[PDB]
Amino acid sequence: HHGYKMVNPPRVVGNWTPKDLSFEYKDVEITTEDNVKLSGWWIDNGSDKTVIPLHGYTSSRWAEHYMRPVIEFLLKEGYNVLAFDFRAHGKSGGKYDKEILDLKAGVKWLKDNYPEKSKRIGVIGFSMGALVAIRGLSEVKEICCGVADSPPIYLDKTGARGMKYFAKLPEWLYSFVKPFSELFINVLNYTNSIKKPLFLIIGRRDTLVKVEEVQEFYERNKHVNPNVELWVTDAPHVRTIQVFPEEWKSRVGEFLKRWMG
Amino acid sequence: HHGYKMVNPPRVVGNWTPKDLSFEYKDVEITTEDNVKLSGWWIDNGSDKTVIPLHGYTSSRWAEHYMRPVIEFLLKEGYNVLAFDFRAHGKSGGKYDKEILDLKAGVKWLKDNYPEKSKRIGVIGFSMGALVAIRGLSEVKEICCGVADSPPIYLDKTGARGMKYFAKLPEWLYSFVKPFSELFINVLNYTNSIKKPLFLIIGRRDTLVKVEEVQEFYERNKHVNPNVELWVTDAPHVRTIQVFPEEWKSRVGEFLKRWMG
Numbered sequence: 001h002h003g004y005k006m007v008n009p010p011r012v013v014g015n016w017t018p019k020d021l022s023f024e025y026k027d028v029e030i031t032t033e034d035n036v037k038l039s040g041w042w043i044d045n046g047s048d049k050t051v052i053p054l055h056g057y058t059s060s061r062w063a064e065h066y067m068r069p070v071i072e073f074l075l076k077e078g079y080n081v082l083a084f085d086f087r088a089h090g091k092s093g094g095k096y097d098k099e100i101l102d103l104k105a106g107v108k109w110l111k112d113n114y115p116e117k118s119k120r121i122g123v124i125g126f127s128m129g130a131l132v133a134i135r136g137l138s139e140v141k142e143i144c145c146g147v148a149d150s151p152p153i154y155l156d157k158t159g160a161r162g163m164k165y166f167a168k169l170p171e172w173l174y175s176f177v178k179p180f181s182e183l184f185i186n187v188l189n190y191t192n193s194i195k196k197p198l199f200l201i202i203g204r205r206d207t208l209v210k211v212e213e214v215q216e217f218y219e220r221n222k223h224v225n226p227n228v229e230l231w232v233t234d235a236p237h238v239r240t241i242q243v244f245p246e247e248w249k250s251r252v253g254e255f256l257k258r259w260m261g
Numbered sequence: 262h263h264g265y266k267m268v269n270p271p272r273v274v275g276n277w278t279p280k281d282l283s284f285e286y287k288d289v290e291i292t293t294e295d296n297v298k299l300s301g302w303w304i305d306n307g308s309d310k311t312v313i314p315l316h317g318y319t320s321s322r323w324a325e326h327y328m329r330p331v332i333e334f335l336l337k338e339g340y341n342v343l344a345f346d347f348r349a350h351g352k353s354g355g356k357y358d359k360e361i362l363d364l365k366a367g368v369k370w371l372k373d374n375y376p377e378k379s380k381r382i383g384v385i386g387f388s389m390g391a392l393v394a395i396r397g398l399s400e401v402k403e404i405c406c407g408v409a410d411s412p413p414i415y416l417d418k419t420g421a422r423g424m425k426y427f428a429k430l431p432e433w434l435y436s437f438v439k440p441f442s443e444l445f446i447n448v449l450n451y452t453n454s455i456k457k458p459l460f461l462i463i464g465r466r467d468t469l470v471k472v473e474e475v476q477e478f479y480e481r482n483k484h485v486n487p488n489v490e491l492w493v494t495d496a497p498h499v500r501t502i503q504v505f506p507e508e509w510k511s512r513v514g515e516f517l518k519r520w521m522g
Contacts, residue, residue: 001325002276011269012440020263058437064262065436165431170468172498173426175326176319177434179273207431237433 007183008088008096014062018043023075030084032105034098039091040084040106043075048119049260050080050110054103054129056238058180060090065242066126066149073241073249074124077256080117082106086129097185099132100139107142120144120260124252126238127152127208131187138193145197145259147252150206150238151187153213159184161208191220197227199255201248203235229255268444269349269357275323279304284336291345293366295359300352301345301367304336309380310521311341311371315364315390317499319441321351326503327387327410334502334510335385338517341378343367347390358446360393361400368403381405381521385513387499388413388469392448399454406458406520408513411467411499412448414474420445422469452481458488460516462509464496490516 018025023043030038041061053061053070061067061083074081086102087094103123110118123146125133130151137146152158163181166174198221202214211232218230231251235243279286284304291299302322314322314331322328322344335342347363348355364384371379384407386394391412398407413419424442427435459482463475472493479491492512496504 002281004274005276006272006274008272010271010437010440011267013265013267015263015266063436162434165434168429170426170497171500172469173423173438175324176271177438179271208433236431239432 007179009058012060021072030105030109032101036087036094038084043081045080047080050118051122052082054125056127056129060085066238069241100135103136138190147199149201153187158208197259200230203233206237208237268440270319273321282333291366291370293362297348297355299345304342306341308341311379312383313343315386317388321346327499330502361396364397399451408460410462414448419469458520461491464494467498469498
C-alpha cells in the first residue's frame with residue numbers, strides 16, 4: 001500500500017437542535033486564523049457565563065450519547081453555550097493538531113461579539129475534544145476552567161489499541177475503517193503548564209485510554225496545580241455521562257459552579 | 262435516537278497517481294448539471310476509446326484493492342481513462358441516487374472537450390459504482406458497454422446484511438459505523454431497458470450481495486439483451502480483480518475488445 005495523502009473524517013449531522021431542548025439559538029459561522037469556516041450554535045441563555053463543549057474525533061456537536069446530554073445539562077444549569085463542529089467535522093469547513101485554532105476562534109468570536117455573555121468561559125471536552133480542552137486550558141488565557149473526559153494521553157498507544165479490534169471485521173468493513181486508523185503531540189508536557197482548575201474523568205472500561213495514563217497526568221499536574229481533580233469511573237470511553245448521568249452532572253455541575261461563578 | 266439529517270461519506274485520498282504507472286495525466290474539474298464540482302484524472306492514452314471506472318460507496322478513485330488495478334489494466338490495454346471521485350467522495354465537492362448525474366457530467370465533459378478521444382465510451386463499476394454503471398448503460402446513450410462488478414440489486418437487503426456485522430464491535434467503533442448504515446432505487450427495473458452489452462460479475466464469498474440476486478437480474482435481462490453475460494466467481498465483494506487478477510483482466514479485456522473496437 002502507498003499510504004494516504006489525506007483522510008477527512010466522516011461528516012455526521014444529527015436531527016435535533018437546541019429548539020428540541022426548548023432553548024432559542026443562532027446558527028453561526030466562525031472563521032479561524034487560518035481561514036477555516038466553522039459551523040456552530042450560539043445559545044444565549046441570558047448568562048454572563050459561557051461553556052464550550054468539544055466533541056471527539058469523527059464526531060460532531062450532535063452526538064447523542066454525550067453531546068446532546070452535555071448541551072442539555074449546560075443549558076439547564078443556566079450557562080450560555082457555544083457548540084461548534086471541529087474543522088472537517090459535521091457542518092464545518094476545512095480539510096483535515098489544528099483543533100486548538102478552532103477553539104481559539106470560538107473564544108475570540110465570543111469575546112469580540114458577546115463579551116458581556118462570556119465574562120467567564122469554561123470548556124468541557126470528550127476524547128479528542130478533551131485533549132483540545134487540556135491544550136486550551138494551558139494556551140488560551142480567556143478559559144478559566146476545564147473538564148477533560150477520556151483524554152488520550154499517548155496518542156500512538158491509543159491508536160495502536162484501536163487497531164487490535166480491526167482483525168475481526170469482514171474485509172469490506174476493514175478497508176472502510178483503516179484509513180482513519182492510519183491518520184490517527186506531547187500531551188504530558190501540559191502537566192507543567194496547566195495552572196487552572198481541571199477535572200479529569202476516565203473510565204475503567206475504556207478500551208482506548210488506560211486509567212494509568214490519565215492517573216500519571218494527574219500525579220504530575222497536581223504538584224503545580226492545586227485545583228486538578230481526578231474521577232475514575234466504571235464506564236466505557238466518553239460514556240460516563242450516559243451510564244452515570246446523575247453523578248456526572250452532579251460532579252461536573254459542582255465543578256462549574258465553583259469556577260464559573 | 263433522532264436520526265441523521267445528513268451523512269457525508271469519509272473522504273479518502275490515496276498516495277499514488279497515474280505517474281506511478283508511467284502514464285501522463287491531467288487533474289481536472291467536472292461540473293454536474295446540479296452544479297457539483299467533481300475532481301478527476303483525465304488520462305489521454307492516445308486512443309479514440311475511453312473507459313470510465315466507477316468506485317464504490319465510501320471509496321474513491323484511489324482504492325488500491327480494485328481501482329488502482331483496474332486503472333492500470335485499462336491503460337495497459339491502450340484505452341484513455343477518465344477516473345473521477347463521485348460527489349462527496351475523495352476530492353470531489355458536493356454534500357451527500359444522484360451519482361448518475363456525476364457519470365452524465367463525465368461523459369458530457371469527454372464529448373464536449375475530447376470527442377476524438379471518446380468515439381467509444383465504456384464503463385466499469387464496482388459495488389455502488391456497478392449500480393451506476395447499470396443505470397448509465399440504460400440512460401446514457403453515449404455509453405456502448407458496461408461491466409458491473411458486485412452490483413447491489415436489492416439495496417435494502419444489502420444494507421440489512423451489513424448491519425449483521427455491527428454487533429461484534431466495541432461501542433466506540435459502532436457509533437462510528439452506524440450513521441453510514443442508516444444512510445444506506447429499483448435496480449431490477451433496468452432489466453427491461455438495458456439493450457447494450459453488459460458483463461455482470463458476482464462472487465460467492467460476497468457478504469453484501471447474493472449470487473441469486475445478480476443471477477435473477479441476468480435471467481430477466483437476457484430475454485431482451487443478447488449481449489449480457491454473467492460470471493460467478495469465488496471471491497469476496499469487489500475483490501475478484503484482487504484474488505483472480507489474471508482471469509478478471511483476461512475476461513474483461515476480451516469483453517472490452519469486443520465492444521470498444
